[PDB]
Amino acid sequence: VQLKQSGAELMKPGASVKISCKATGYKFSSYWIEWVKQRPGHGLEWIGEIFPGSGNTNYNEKFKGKATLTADTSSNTAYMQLSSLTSEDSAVYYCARRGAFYSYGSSYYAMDFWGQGTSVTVSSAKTTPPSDYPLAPVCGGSSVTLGCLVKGYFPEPVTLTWNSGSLSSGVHTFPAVLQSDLYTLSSSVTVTSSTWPSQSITCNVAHPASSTKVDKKIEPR
Amino acid sequence: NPKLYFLSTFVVTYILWFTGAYLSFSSTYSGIYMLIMLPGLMAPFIISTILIAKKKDFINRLFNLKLINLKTIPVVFLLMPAVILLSILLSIPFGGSISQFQFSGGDFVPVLFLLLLAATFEELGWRGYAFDSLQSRYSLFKASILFGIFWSLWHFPLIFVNNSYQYEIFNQSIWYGLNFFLSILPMGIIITWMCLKNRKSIILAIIFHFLINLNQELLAITQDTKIIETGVLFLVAAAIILYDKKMFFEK
Amino acid sequence: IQLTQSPASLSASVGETVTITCRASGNIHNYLAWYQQKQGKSPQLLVYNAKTLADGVPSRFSGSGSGTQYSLKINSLQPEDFGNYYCQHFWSTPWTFGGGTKLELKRADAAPTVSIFPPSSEQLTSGGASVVCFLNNFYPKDINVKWKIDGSERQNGVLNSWTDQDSKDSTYSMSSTLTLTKDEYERHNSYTCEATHKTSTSPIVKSFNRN
Incomplete structure (x- = not known):
């Protein structure tokens, strides 16, 4: 039993997306298909369900009109269409099955199998390469910390390294955050006082979507 | 008074179960919804007993084991499980059910006592005043069908109570729901016939009813297979009418 | 429900x-x-x-x-x-x-290592000014960051980012960035990153002056 969902989507606000969920290993028409929304900080949220073969549906009131459930029994595939996309729709979307219905002793009241998830992002941002900046310590110990600020890019991801990946210890690369409609990311590296500035240290930022690769050497102020 | 029994049972069942259906979706009072369903189930039994109280053979049929025909023991025990497993076999040429023998479907001890209690509370009514009232006015054949219809439409409020069998089957598919109400028709014929063959023994009807419930729990089948089962029930009901057709149409 | x-x-x-x-x-x-x-x-x-x-x-x-x-x-x-x-x-x-x-x-509990970084000259050139504060390798995860400019608590223009529990040493880290225009940045002197964590009975402060 397996549920495979379609790949990641990037959409402008006001458009529509159609997410698929292919079923294998069981009789597609005899089980409920569920759809669940997951945003960071909002936990799991139930969207609705469809019974393929009957076409019966139970919706959450909040997603009525927003989400549209369909099912094709000839290709064993369930579909969910999200219309009039806005930023709030940005989340991971799962499809999941319920157990077969029996009067007694059934997993029918459970989501027993889940798809791998479909990441949906909706934004008006143009593709933009990051401006990135070296961060040397204050002009005026046993260890020293350096920095690399990656500001104003779209979309995700970027690949940040230190000395082309040779420098992997003491590195913290932080999750990107979104101020305005562009992403900002930062990274710190901690080394012993014997390492820097005695040795050269450079952060390297790759951004494939804008096809850019920039190196920034850390120099004392 | 056949016109009084069923209409009074119909209304009492409908008032209690639809009240219990409202509480079944209440976010405050759902905790007590099952104690309103109880007198609803017990209605035909208490109505029957009251009408009788207001004969010794009712007492006889209740306590007299000698009424039972032991030649019908193999069919009392074995028919329903045979029907169920046959349905799975008949399913196989059509898609699916290879897994089904596994019987993945199905606390275990108390649910038995509840099934035996429901089989008791139902048959004390149906095999009391109920069917005798019909058989007096009608031929056995149309009395059994009139019973099958009433008994089927008797389950009607259950469609609207949260998480009931009737609720979930209609929830999934219109065909699964109709299939159930369609299956009560030949089922009412088979149980009825079994009761007469054992000289109207109410105790046997209880056991048979209880056994039908038990096998439908232990030996679980998909709704798609239950549609095939319904057909098998019609073929068995038809075969039984033919075997005892003189009994069925005699006056 | x-x-x-x-x-x-x-x-x-x-x-x-x-x-x-x-x-x-x-x-x-x-x-x-x-x-x-x-x-x-x-x-x-x-x-x-x-x-x-x-x-x-x-x-x-x-x-x-x-x-x-x-x-x-x-x-x-x-x-x-x-x-x-x-x-x-x-x-x-x-x-x-x-x-x-x-x-x-x-x-085991670990105090955050706190570092503060003035804006790079490259950023100032383009008219922007971000002050970055890293708070690394602390445990447990709960922590608070307070930004001060010339002694006054500043809440706006600041973005935070938290890592998940580290896959090696099982600690936590935090990055706090205070973004300003070059104009407002250059009209102030003292900049302060101030951290509240359980392993310290008083805030851990890191600061610099533009001088």
Whole structure:
């Protein structure tokens, strides 16, 4: 039993997306298909369900009109269409099955199998390469910390390294955050006082979507 | 008074179960919804007993084991499980059910006592005043069908109570729901016939009813297979009418 | 019907036994399922009907409860049991999930290493000015950052980012960035990153002056 969902989507606000969920290993028409929304900080949220073969549906009131459930029994595939996309729709979307219905002793009241998830992002941002900046310590110990600020890019991801990946210890690369409609990311590296500035240290930022690769050497102020 | 029994049972069942259906979706009072369903189930039994109280053979049929025909023991025990497993076999040429023998479907001890209690509370009514009232006015054949219809439409409020069998089957598919109400028709014929063959023994009807419930729990089948089962029930009901057709149409 | 999970966070070690609870706002009649979710992965079913183990699930997991109160117990935690846990009722639509419980790996306390960084000359050239403060390798995860400009608490123009529990030493890290225009940055002198953590009875402060 397996549920495979379609790949990641990037959409402008006001458009529509159609997410698929292919079923294998069981009789597609005899089980409920569920759809669940997951945003960071909002936990799991139930969207609705469809019974393929009957076409019966139970919706959450909040997603009525927003989400549209369909099912094709000839290709064993369930579909969910999200219309009039806005930023709030940005989340991971799962499809999941319920157990077969029996009067007694059934997993029918459970989501027993889940798809791998479909990441949906909706934004008006143009593709933009990051401006990135070296961060040397204050002009005026046993260890020293350096920095690399990656500001104003779209979309995700970027690949940040230190000395082309040779420098992997003491590195913290932080999750990107979104101020305005562009992403900002930062990274710190901690080394012993014997390492820097005695040795050269450079952060390297790759951004494939804008096809850019920039190196920034850390120099004392 | 056949016109009084069923209409009074119909209304009492409908008032209690639809009240219990409202509480079944209440976010405050759902905790007590099952104690309103109880007198609803017990209605035909208490109505029957009251009408009788207001004969010794009712007492006889209740306590007299000698009424039972032991030649019908193999069919009392074995028919329903045979029907169920046959349905799975008949399913196989059509898609699916290879897994089904596994019987993945199905606390275990108390649910038995509840099934035996429901089989008791139902048959004390149906095999009391109920069917005798019909058989007096009608031929056995149309009395059994009139019973099958009433008994089927008797389950009607259950469609609207949260998480009931009737609720979930209609929830999934219109065909699964109709299939159930369609299956009560030949089922009412088979149980009825079994009761007469054992000289109207109410105790046997209880056991048979209880056994039908038990096998439908232990030996679980998909709704798609239950549609095939319904057909098998019609073929068995038809075969039984033919075997005892003189009994069925005699006056 | 809303469902509430407690605690939101639970620190534990391998071999320990822990219990998570779920509260329903109304009687859900044992129609309750428990799921487990690793970071970046989909939820997996553990328990349904409040009490029944799903196929493949180890017997160290167990569920109990009735009416409005339910709980999940893990006896002798294994490394693989660390992640998120959710409860979900199946009594009536809409189905609601609980806010979740994160079961994190227990660790020795560690003070944050705090570093502050003035804007780079390259950024100032383009008219921007960001002050960056890293707070690295602390435990437990709870922490607060206060930005001060010339002694006054500044709340606007600041973005924070938190790492998840480190996959090597199991600590936490935080990055705090204060973004200003070049104009407003150059009209002030003192800049201060101020950290509140449990391992210190008073704030850890890191500061510089433009001089």
